[PDB]
Symmetry: C2
Subunit: 246 residues, 2 copies
């Protein structure tokens, strides 16, 4: 039982994410591809990918990594600025971090949005072959139809949603909905489960809600059911997940 190592399935990258592997080695698998992120690297994750991850911590007492997830505004603006300025391998990218680059990582302030975008802009100008990055930021700024489905469901995550309700709200047929979600490699039940499990993951890391509270917040009747669903979904228990990232 290696506390320094964990394997997690069905990770959805909800926001475009920049990740610095401050305390881990990370193997990312998705679609039979494999990307290794070594120690002390910057990692760029396209918004919307589902990945499995194998993580190895060098030091147990700290978090595996440091991440920067960009909200909806931040992303689009960053697309806007990047345009005015300028397969999995094109969705996930790792780079080594300099003292100059890392020092800017150190100063990033999540509150000052302008300051944050300028920092990211600076960081991207310094990278070799930065088009792969510019593509994913731009690609992951367009809202697909499943984003629309997601946004409808996020408003009331506790509701008993159905493919009927969704197709009604879109003035379309059920087959239109599922076939449109098929063209984006997902389906309605996957979106809903992936939304509840993403939220639950974040709620767990806050350490200020009980499991039964968490399940009720994401709309699941029983705490013991939620724990079973979480383990089936991620491949670890809520407890195991929390201890690794705590």
């Amino acid at each position: 039982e290696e506390k320094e190592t964990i394997k997690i399935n069905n990770i959805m990258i909800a926001k475009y994410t920049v990740l610095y592997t401050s305390n881990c080695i990370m193997d990312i698998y998705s679609e039979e591809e494999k990307i290794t992120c070594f120690s002390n690297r910057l990692v760029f994750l396209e918004r919307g990918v589902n990945i499995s991850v194998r993580m190895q911590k060098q030091i147990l007492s700290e978090k595996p990594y440091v991440a920067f997830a960009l909200n909806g505004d931040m992303l689009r603006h960053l697309k806007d600025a990047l345009m005015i300025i300028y397969s999995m391998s094109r969705k996930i990218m790792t780079t080594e971090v300099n003292k100059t680059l890392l020092d800017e990582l150190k100063n990033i302030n999540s509150h000052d949005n302008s300051a944050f975008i300028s920092s990211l802009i600076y960081l991207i100008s310094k990278l070799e072959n930065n088009e792969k990055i510019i593509e994913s930021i731009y690609i992951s700024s367009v809202s697909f139809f499943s984003d629309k489905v997601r946004n409808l469901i996020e408003k009331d995550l506790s509701r008993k949603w159905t493919l009927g309700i969704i197709a009604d709200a879109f003035n379309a047929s059920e087959i239109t909905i599922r076939k449109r979600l098929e063209s984006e490699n997902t389906n309605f039940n996957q979106i809903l489960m992936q939304l509840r499990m993403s939220k639950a993951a974040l709620l767990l890391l806050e350490n200020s809600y009980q499991i039964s509270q968490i399940s009720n917040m994401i709309g699941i009747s029983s705490a013991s059911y939620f724990i079973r669903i979480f383990n089936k979904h991620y491949g670890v228990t809520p407890k195991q997940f929390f201890t690794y990232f705590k």
Copy 2:
């Protein structure tokens, strides 16, 4: 001695960032006065006319480092700044202290790569306190006023014998329209034409690969000796003195 120079009627043709790497500088413009010490960054709004008194710290070296943005650079930088932040003399000329880490960014600037260069400026601006006056001046200096239109018409043939009639014809307007539109911006036609010819002459001189006689014919002035008189009258220093100071 001769390490100090005073130059009059400098027009900031492009928006300019200037690092006073080797000088102290007094800037007089709009009947105001701004002292920039050694090791400061200076932000100069496009279109200001200034007079400068400079004192070099080290005689053998050039007085300062400058970055002038052409039209593309400027508007692109405006576009990005508006996307990132949203939509009197003190607000046109601004000097700031630059950190050592930021100083390395001064060192890091490469003028040949546009994308890299704009990003760095955005980074430099985010790191500054009260950077709205800077954002203001950049945005203010991105619009083309009517005198920019006149300048752009004149630039097509700097040697031509321009007149207010020719200008007014080329705009399908009356001479009164032209002079009164140029008045509402505190300028007139003769001032635009003379400051255009002296800006160009100044830059050709620093190239050191054109003769005075060549330079005078390129900007549209009959004689080399006349051009030398006009340059001295305009800048308050001779072409040789001006060249030697920056050489």
